[PDB]
Amino acid sequence: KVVATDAYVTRTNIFYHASSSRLLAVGHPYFSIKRANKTVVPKVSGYQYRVFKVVLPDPNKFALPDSSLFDPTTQRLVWACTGLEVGRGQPLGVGVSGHPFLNKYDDVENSGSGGNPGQDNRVNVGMDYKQTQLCMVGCAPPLGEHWGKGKQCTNTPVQAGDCPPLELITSVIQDGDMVDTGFGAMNFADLQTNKSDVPIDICGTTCKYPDYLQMAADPYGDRLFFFLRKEQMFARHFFNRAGEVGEPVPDTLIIKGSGNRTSVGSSIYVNTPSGSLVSSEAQLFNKPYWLQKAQGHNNGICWGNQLFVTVVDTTRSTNMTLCASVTTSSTYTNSDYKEYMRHVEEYDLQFIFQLCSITLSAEVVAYIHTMNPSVLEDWNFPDPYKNLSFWEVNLKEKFSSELDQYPLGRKFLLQS
């Protein structure tokens, strides 16, 4: 029922290069800065999804060299992605996140500690996250999965303070969403009500993980032209949570003591992650990728003249520390200086597209009415994505037929 694009999309020999030039994002790696109403400094962190909405010029309205390539009737044009290079322009490094009131009780990795459960046992703790690299391409935005407070309720009927129901939520990954760290893909705003179980840059948001299984199993495969990924982490330290244990250890599994003790210690264990070593040999970017064959049926056809490129790069997450002097006392005094957190992201999106024509027979028009119907409506033969947020990359007026004048174009001529 679903056929590959190679059956009804004829290929040409016309190739074009388009570069986004240098793209810079400068902000705060932990939280947005709002004074007094709207944001003044955005939240820019290396552990955020970079979902670029690349807008392509309509080839049916493009100033092509010759219009004899196709007939205005019965035939329409569409761009096909054949080359891609996501350039990163920052030094490799690891950034750290933390929480001045992290819900950490005792370092449970080694031993300790007797009995100090009290009002507030939160400690100022910092950590580095799990290393994650990934990049995807499609003509539709990618799907991410995360665990959120599920619809209530499986079984019945009563509150309160009980464990919230979990539901696997599939959603659209927007530009700025957090990637998984070392604590799963979940909605920390709803599932952790104390605002203190995870570092501050994720404790009020949601970490989303790509739903590779669903996007690969989609019929047309508009969301996964291809993907590359590298995740790695290890257990740095261990500790337990402060507060009441909602679900105690069964009576059958612990022999109660002990004269003293008698109160079972906190049995809610969670470990801090660590991204380990970052190296140049492990880099996925700064090298071209050629879409020789697509996993789905959509073989790189950019329907709607748009392209969604998702990028996650935690290998350049170094957070710069700034120090501004308020005064200069005779001696050194901490009150004279203000410390600031700043993070930066540098991107250079390079694409190479192939022009393609489609002979619109009765069967072709029928097959294209199903699937995305706007493809026929925009061809003359409202956007539901205006509620989401993507990094707009306007590549109109940026297409060039002189391939050898650009790095990715030079690599294309000598390859594939």
Added chain:
Amino acid sequence: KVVATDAYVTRTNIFYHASSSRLLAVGHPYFSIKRANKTVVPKVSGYQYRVFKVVLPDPNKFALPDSSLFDPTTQRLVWACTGLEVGRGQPLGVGVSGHPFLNKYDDVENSGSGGNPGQDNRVNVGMDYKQTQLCMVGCAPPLGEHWGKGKQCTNTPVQAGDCPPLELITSVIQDGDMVDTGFGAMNFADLQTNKSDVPIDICGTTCKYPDYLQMAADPYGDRLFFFLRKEQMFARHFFNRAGEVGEPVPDTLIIKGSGNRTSVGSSIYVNTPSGSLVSSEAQLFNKPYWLQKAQGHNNGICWGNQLFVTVVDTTRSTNMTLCASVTTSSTYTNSDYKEYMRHVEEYDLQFIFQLCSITLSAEVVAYIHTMNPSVLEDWNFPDPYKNLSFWEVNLKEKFSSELDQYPLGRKFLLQS
């Protein structure tokens, strides 16, 4: 519009070898030593850029074996780089930097500490930097990028002590500039006014990182004949900065406590880097590199009879400790000895060039007037780089046509 040199630069069969002999740099790994006005001991650190300005003899004025190769009119000669080996002659190792008054408050990786904010909480802390290897070749000096105090200001209008505006500044990498460490590529002299956030060898200078994206996007590509790189680091320890938080954690992100506590801990986290293991298998040097094909249009043509070779090697950063006795008491007394820091760098630059001729037609002269016009002026058909600082390597009177009499020449005959 821009064409490769292979179209208008004809190749010959004449090859030459040129060696810089042993190059030694001995100094202080942290700072220059000035008594009383000018420097007596230079700053020599493994984390400095080694930008060698290799001067080549003019082939149009060279004592060639036969002048019948070219016509003095309509034709000119120029050297082309075909072989390169940057030899390093020191034991592999890791050197450490530190600061007797580093702005470190509490070890935030594990836990702690209650409430000791005071006048001065700076601690004497030492650390090892991120491992970085790289080497580049071009006929123009390389471009580096760093974050500096930006032009004031985006938005308006008031001081003081606020966060300084950030601007990505591209500049020329001079010999002696500091490579990135673990705290990013920034101008620590302007962005960190307390002179105490990073170790002393970078706290008063600027760390520059190569702008690979810009140098690769250059039309003529005179700055990147090729490049090789290897960066690696991991997070050693975590801590927070002392002083006032310039941008506090938003309210929505922390539940205020606590009877005690009540004061939000320092939420300015930065981690110490570590270069991890250095090994011989990871070495980029002591092996020849043959410029088979260039990424840019300049396919290894040394315009102006000069060649810029940039080298960064942190795998031989071992800092030697010297101890001189002022006196010799009957017992051991620390007052009898002075401790000194010394670092050394040993290089041996080996090149193999190919003679090339250029037939200067009306179109060729026009294409060469654009781009670098001095190429035509020096051919008889002020230097803006005298304000910069490079390691002068005079290879005039060092060219030899007997290739088999040298190591790189022997490797050239049996290869390529």
Added chain:
Amino acid sequence: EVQLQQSGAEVVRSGASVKLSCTASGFNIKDYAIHWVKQRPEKGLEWIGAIDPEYGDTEYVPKFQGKATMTADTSSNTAYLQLSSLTSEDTAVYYCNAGHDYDRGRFPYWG
């Protein structure tokens, strides 16, 4: 250009409440640590409490707990200090002072 304007002098009968205000100390993102000081012609200076705009934290003295109530309006504004059952021992001059950005000791900016 860093001065603090208050509410103004007030004559109150015994047994009624009074509300004092401060100005230009307590903004979003900045973050001051506001203190209040009582000056009685016999007891000198007495510290009342420390309030932090933004977070809105509150600390008091056991002598003044139940006598002085502290509030903070994050927008503009602030810092309101109100006293309940007023007696003859409350006849004093009250100051709103803020050390620049944070902490206790420092009062360089007084009301």
